[PDB]
């Protein structure tokens, strides 16, 4: 009773296909045609943070837009004061291969993770003045690729075992389990109201999730290769994904389609990181060819290039007030642009 | 007015940097190795959670070997974490399924990855005793073995069969065919023959890591 189920799935796919095709009456290019361009966007590197011994995989800003954490595979989480280029903490880890780092919006906690299959929470606000491990979350069967805080007690993780998970930090137990991907999940992005999040795995698919009930709401296809980065639009009604096929793409949640593609013939390297600006007009993307291209979101134009790294750009992040952007790379340097 | 809350930050940065200067010296004095192998390759034998660490020490040199335990058989996203390693220790069951060809395909993918272009491979061609035991009691899966002649630069063991010598050197040449087709002087391959009982494997890895460090230092002077 297998081919009949597959033909039912096929006719459901066809119904979804033409139900999406009936909604595309015009293109985003047709509508933002007469909008004025943004011009050449020139940025300057304002700080270069030094101190990591090996390549940087992850970084995350604090919600005060002054502090940022970074993770390097020499086994250190270094917290920085971006305004004064001073180190506030240097946390040694029990596993060298860290691949994700998260900053809690309260500012009290930091979470790292990697090939140890464990999400370790750290407490930056202690009595003895020592940053110690609060809890180590076990239960994933593959490596951790992404982790994002929701409160001081909840955290969502992404693993290489094709699963996302919701955790309850005070009990250490996995509450909700998000299944559905057929390849390893690489990135997460939370919605601005923390009721939804979207994941991008190495099966050329993006999926929307309900944090409350644990159900998949929508699935988005269109990329040809593995998705490596997802970011939400600042209003929560759209998101952007970067892949190994050298294209970023914009999706809507109410139209269930793709609205724009951002590609050039001179770009043949994959995309590592994706971030929007505060207005949502600029899309910043880090590439494997050591650069970072700025895009116009409502159009498909390059507004500028952030050049200055000497190895693969690994992580991007725009502050909560949009004042600056931070880039890390395998040259073991962090650069802040403005 | 606010300078009292800036000298504290400067003192904290002083202390952090004075610790990081010790971390840098303990980091650069250690050589990290990735122990990779296929199924039934005897990898856990020559070893003598997602990652299994194992530290050893040869002539006051600290080594740090790593083995992937819990990960799936996808590898294209977590093998990129293993640049900056001194070498990749690759183990093959050199003896149901054509697992020798699976090992050749994995080696071809590792040697030709955009990010592994600078990492060297120490090839441990394992199970030579079983290879002899089987060739005493192959060209069906490798047609070019009917044309293969033993290299006259061979270094056989005393009293050994000219059959098992030819078989083992055929497999070594199958791997060197991939190793020599690319590289352009960026990374090197070190093939070895390891049996069931070999204490010399740690010494072999030591000598090969020494060679890699020497060649990197020479390339920094544009001498090679």
């Amino acid at each position: 009773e297998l081919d009949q189920l597959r033909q039912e799935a096929e006719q459901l796919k066809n119904q979804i296909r033409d139900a999406r095709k009936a909604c595309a009456d015009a293109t985003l290019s047709q509508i933002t045609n007469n909008i004025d361009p943004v011009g050449r966007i020139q940025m300057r590197t304002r700080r270069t943070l030094r101190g990591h011994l090996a390549k940087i995989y992850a970084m995350h800003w604090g919600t005060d837009s002054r502090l940022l954490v970074s993770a390097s595979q020499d086994g250190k989480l270094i917290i920085w004061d971006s305004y004064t280029t001073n180190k506030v903490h240097a946390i040694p880890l029990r596993s060298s291969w860290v691949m994700t780092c998260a900053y809690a919006p309260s500012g009290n906690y930091v979470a790292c993770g990697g090939l140890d299959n464990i999400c370790s929470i750290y407490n930056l606000k202690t009595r003895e003045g020592n940053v110690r491990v609060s809890r180590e979350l076990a239960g994933h069967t593959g490596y951790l690729s992404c982790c994002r805080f929701l409160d001081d007690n909840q955290i969502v993780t992404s693993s290489g075992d094709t699963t996302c998970a919701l955790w309850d930090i005070e009990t250490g137990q996995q509450t909700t389990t998000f299944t559905g991907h057929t390849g390893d999940v690489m990135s997460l992005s939370l919605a601005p109201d923390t009721r939804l999040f979207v994941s991008g795995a190495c099966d050329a698919s993006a999926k929307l999730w309900d944090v409350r009930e644990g159900m998949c709401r929508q699935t988005f296809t269109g990329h040809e290769s593995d998705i490596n980065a997802i970011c939400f639009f600042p209003n929560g009604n759209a998101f952007a994904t970067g892949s190994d096929d050298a294209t970023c793409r914009l999706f809507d949640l109410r139209a269930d389609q793709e609205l724009m593609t951002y590609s050039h013939d001179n770009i043949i390297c994959g995309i590592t990181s994706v971030s929007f600006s505060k207005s949502g007009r600029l899309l910043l993307a880090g590439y494997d060819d050591f650069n970072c291209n700025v895009w116009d979101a409502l159009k498909a134009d390059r507004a500028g290039v952030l050049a200055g790294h000497d190895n693969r750009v690994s992580c991007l992040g725009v502050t909560d007030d949009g004042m600056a952007v931070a880039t890390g790379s395998w040259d073991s340097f962090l650069k802040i642009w403005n | 007015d606010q300078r009292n809350e800036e000298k504290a930050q400067r003192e904290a940065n002083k202390k952090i940097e004075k610790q990081l200067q010790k971390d840098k010296q303990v980091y650069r004095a250690t050589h990290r190795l990735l122990l990779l192998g296929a199924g039934e390759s005897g990898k856990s034998t020559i070893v003598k959670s997602g990652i299994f660490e194992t530290k050893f020490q040869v002539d006051k040199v600290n080594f740090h070997m790593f083995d992937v335990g819990a990960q799936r058989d996808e590898r294209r996203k977590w093998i990129q974490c293993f640049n900056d390693v001194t070498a990749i220790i690759f183990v093959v069951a050199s003896s149901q399924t054509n697992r020798l060809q699976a090992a050749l395909k994995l080696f071809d993918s590792i040697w030709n990855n955009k990010w592994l272009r600078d990492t060297s491979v120490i090839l441990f061609l394992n199970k030579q005793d079983l290879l002899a035991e089987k060739v005493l009691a192959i060209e069906d899966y490798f047609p070019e073995f009917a044309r293969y002649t033993t290299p006259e630069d061979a270094t056989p063991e005393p009293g050994e069969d000219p059959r098992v010598t030819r078989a083992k050197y055929f497999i070594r040449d199958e791997f060197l065919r991939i190793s020599t087709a690319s590289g352009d002087g960026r990374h090197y391959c070190y093939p070895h023959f390891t049996c069931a009982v070999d204490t010399e494997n740690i010494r072999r890895v030591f000598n090969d890591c020494r060679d890699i460090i020497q060649r990197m230092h020479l390339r920094q002077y544009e001498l090679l």
Partner: nanobody
Amino acid sequence: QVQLQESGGGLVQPGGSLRLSCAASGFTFSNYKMNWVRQAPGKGLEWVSDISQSGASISYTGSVKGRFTISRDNAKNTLYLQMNSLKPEDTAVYYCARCPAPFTRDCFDVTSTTYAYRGQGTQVTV
């Protein structure tokens, strides 16, 4: 969507010949190296042959050399395997697989149990 559709399987009394086709929609077929992988009953996934972006570099496993020919047609988005002089040990489900990344020479995990860029396969029986 990245979709691969095979056809051309069936029954061949030993010694005959078959042609397998693979229709590919959902990606730029010219930027990708393609593969042919099979699964014998009670066995794992094995690698049969591969072909580059342009059909310049071609490789086969030793058990099929001189008997199979892989070929592309980058214009009509199709891939072929001409199975000539079939032995009774060639019975397997044959899958059309794609390397995961454009403009690359390495293909890591085509013979994995859960690989996304691979069709449902066709069953040839000798």
